[PDB]
Design a protein around this ligand. Structure first.
Ligand SMILES: Nc1ncnc2c1ncn2[C@@H]1O[C@H](COP(=O)(O)OP(=O)(O)O)[C@@H](O)[C@H]1O
Ligand SMILES: [Mg+2]
Length: 406
């Protein structure tokens, strides 16, 4: 068992080898440990963000505005690209590995004989890191689902659902209603429940009513469009806003969370936040002439958004790797509406699809030995007017980031 002075990699190896399969399903274990360590109140204001797509960029938009307003802010996010330290930002910055090791050591001591999962352990450690930082606002990205996610042990002041879409091949009972019910478990009685999904399943309204949360839906209570763009909640209008480097829907969800939070925020901080907001690997431009873009899209809903974005930036060359338990067929079909040339590569581990599993869905494609090789060939092929897009999984993006030492 590692200690406070152990390298972070030792802590991660420890967590990766945890035998979590037989432990009791649900939040009782992690809740008990959080109580023991007084971790349930990481800041006086808490925002929890669930969704299929858009959690990270919603969180980063909240973060950018609140930081522009001079507040102390922490964000917990998952998964990571290159470094575990990406998962906890304070004042917009990653912490040292040594701070993480010390925090993990406090969690290890506090849990006693209670078993915890990797993500439970990580989430409690993030809460400890936030607590010691004396923050104004903490933003929690839900890891998976909502009702049973480790982040749902904390009572949020505003909760949000960013979108609802399928994000996995077939599964028992796995439909929009089921997906929505589970996410809505992050809602709280007497608190705003912000839904940025325009095609909202009824289950979300049902859970809000069951819990007594105040539901504020996109296209019902608030909406947006579009120099700049515009946002409205009843008679409140924010007009001619800067267009952020995040999907607009998610910036709009962020503004709604901030509006219903009642935090006092200047027009200036909102505009400055919007101009700053971005996240690595979310429509990230790495190079120009040819345009090289990285995007972690891994389901059809995300691919639809990416196609709509590519349309507004000559041939499109896609470097693609995906996980096998994802809807490969639907993701590739959607992307194929805009992609001209396909560069398929395998992903590693047991969950990765082979280049062949991708190519079998593509009328014409080339296959490569790995993502780096595919990407380098695309770059070699590209004319200055071309767009090279690296997509399909956070793993595919991460391979290219590591190759570029970004
Ligand atoms: N509102 C949205 N609609 C469709 N796709 C989205 C939306 N928000 C994000 N995406 C897609 O999902 C990917 C991950 O975005 P992110 O904000 O990190 O979401 P999450 O944290 O839920 O995975 C993006 O690169 C983009 O492909
Ligand atoms: Mg995320």
């Amino acid at each position: 068992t590692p200690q406070a002075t152990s390298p972070l990699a030792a802590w991660l190896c420890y967590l990766e080898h945890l035998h979590s399969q037989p432990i009791e399903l649900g939040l009782e274990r992690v809740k008990q440990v959080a109580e023991r360590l007084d971790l349930l109140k990481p800041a006086p204001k808490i925002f929890t963000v669930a969704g299929t797509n858009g959690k990270g960029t919603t969180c980063c938009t909240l973060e950018a505005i609140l930081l522009a307003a001079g507040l102390r802010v922490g964000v917990y996010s998952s998964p990571h690209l290159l470094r575990y330290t990406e998962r906890v930002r304070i004042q917009g910055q990653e912490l040292s590995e040594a701070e993480h090791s010390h925090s993990f050591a406090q969690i290890e001591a506090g849990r006693g004989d209670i078993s915890l999962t990797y993500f439970e352990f990580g989430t409690l450690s993030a809460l400890q890191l936030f607590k010691q930082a004396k923050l104004d606002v903490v933003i929690l990205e839900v890891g998976l689902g909502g009702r049973l996610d480790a982040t749902n042990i904390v009572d949020s002041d505003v909760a949000a659902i960013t979108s609802i879409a399928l994000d996995h091949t077939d599964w028992l009972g796995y439909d929009r209603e089921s997906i929505g019910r589970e996410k809505a478990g992050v809602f709280r009685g007497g608190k705003p429940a912000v839904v940025g999904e325009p095609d909202m399943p009824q289950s979300i309204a049902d859970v809000a009513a069951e819990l007594g949360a105040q539901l504020y839906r996109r296209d019902v209570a608030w909406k947006f469009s579009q120099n700049g763009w515009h946002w409205q909640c009843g008679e409140r209008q924010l007009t001619g806003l800067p267009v952020p480097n995040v999907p607009l829907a998610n910036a709009a969800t962020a503004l709604a969370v901030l509006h219903y939070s009642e935090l006092p925020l200047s027009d200036e901080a909102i505009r400055q936040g919007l101009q700053a907001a971005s996240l690595p690997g979310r429509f990230q431009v790495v190079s120009e002439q040819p345009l090289l873009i990285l995007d972690v899209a891994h389901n059809p809903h995300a691919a639809r958004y990416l196609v709509n974005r590519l349309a507004q930036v000559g041939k499109v060359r896609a470097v693609v790797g995906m996980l096998s338990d994802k809807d490969i067929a639907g993701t590739l079909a959607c992307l194929s509406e805009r992609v001209d040339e396909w560069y398929c590569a395998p992903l590693e581990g047991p969950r990765g699809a082979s280049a062949g599993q991708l190519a079998e869905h593509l009328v014409s494609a080339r296959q490569f030995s790995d993502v780096e090789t595919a990407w380098r060939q695309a770059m070699q092929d590209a004319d200055t007017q071309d767009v090279v897009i690296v997509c399909g999984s956070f793993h595919t993006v991460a391979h290219v980031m590591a190759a570029l030492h970004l």
